[PDB]
Amino acid sequence: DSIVKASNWRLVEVGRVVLIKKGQSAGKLAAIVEIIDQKKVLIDGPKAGVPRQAINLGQVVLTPLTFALPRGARTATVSKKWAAAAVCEKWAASSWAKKIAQRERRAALTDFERFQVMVLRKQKRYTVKKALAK
Amino acid sequence: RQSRRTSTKLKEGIKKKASAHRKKEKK
């Protein structure tokens, strides 16, 4: 029985949702509307507020998220289908976006709020080291 | 093996070959 292993990938395709690293948009989800060439795609995510633009694929990262979108789809039309797939709910459900939040939320701890964390992590340890050596 | 340093007598004995190519074209 034939097993060809692995070969999984994220793909540049019309209607792949992307997360942009470098740029004014940054950390905001848009989706590929039209592949220009090898390196350039045309994006947009009107739900976040990032505008419709030519963009190098080095500016951006593809996500494990995709939806049904026609070729060369306009802003209103993108939004509709984006709302149809309801990606944000799907998106924020991933351990991926949860990490991005967990980076952000930690970054805005007060000095006092950070102290609390230490104090709790003192308790949470005691309960944990109890459970072991049994 | 050959070198890739230009000795200065050559590096400036190129300029004085290039100058001779300038006056040759005009005439």
Partner: protein, 197 residues
């Protein structure tokens, strides 16, 4: 940061690696390079094997013995490489390659202690995928180094005796990742999360 940054050649590019290993001593940074032999380079093999011998010939006239000594053993191969970008000769220099150390294999006391790599210098991550790229090991040998094996063999050993290790650890964790899991979800925890942790 860390006082000793045991690196690890295993898939780096003699150059680059170097450079950085270099700067880092110059800026007072005790390094230590391991698995030298699994260092790499650029280009076919039958090259480095040149861009070398040539190097070999070199040597001194009237008195061959006093001159450009051609070390074989990897480690050193790569040394040079590096003692070549550090004004070696001058207090501040010597004061460096003072700070260095390049073993082939990965003998104690380093076996037992985390290592690391230097992005900004891995074959995988710099060489246009699929391109000729040499791998010391051979390249040493090919020109003297008499041990490739010892290393090798008296290697496999290490790897073993370790992985073994591993396990025992992988086994351990699991338990934790399990305790924490369960005794996770009770208040206290919750709270944390809010803050994030």
């Amino acid at each position: 940061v860390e006082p000793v940054v045991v690196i690890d050649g295993k898939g780096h590019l003699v150059g680059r690696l170097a450079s950085v290993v270099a700067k880092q001593l110059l800026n007072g940074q005790k390094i230590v390079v391991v698995r030298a032999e699994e260092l790499n380079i650029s280009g076919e093999f039958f090259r480095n094997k040149l861009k070398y011998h040539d190097f070999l010939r070199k040597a001194t006239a009237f008195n061959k013995t006093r001159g450009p000594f051609h070390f074989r053993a990897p480690s050193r191969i790569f040394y040079k490489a590096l003692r070549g970008m550090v004004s070696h000769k001058t207090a501040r220099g010597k004061a460096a390659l003072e700070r260095l150390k390049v073993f082939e294999g990965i003998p104690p006391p380093y076996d037992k202690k985390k290592r690391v790599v230097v992005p900004q210098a891995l074959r995988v991550l710099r060489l246009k995928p699929g391109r000729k790229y040499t791998t010391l090991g051979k390249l040493s040998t090919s020109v003297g180094w008499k041990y490739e094996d010892v290393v090798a063999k008296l290697e496999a050993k290490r790897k073993v005796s370790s992985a073994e290790y591993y396990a025992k650890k992988r086994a351990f964790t699991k338990k934790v990742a399990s305790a924490n899991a369960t005794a996770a979800e009770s208040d206290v925890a919750k709270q944390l999360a809010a803050l994030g942790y």
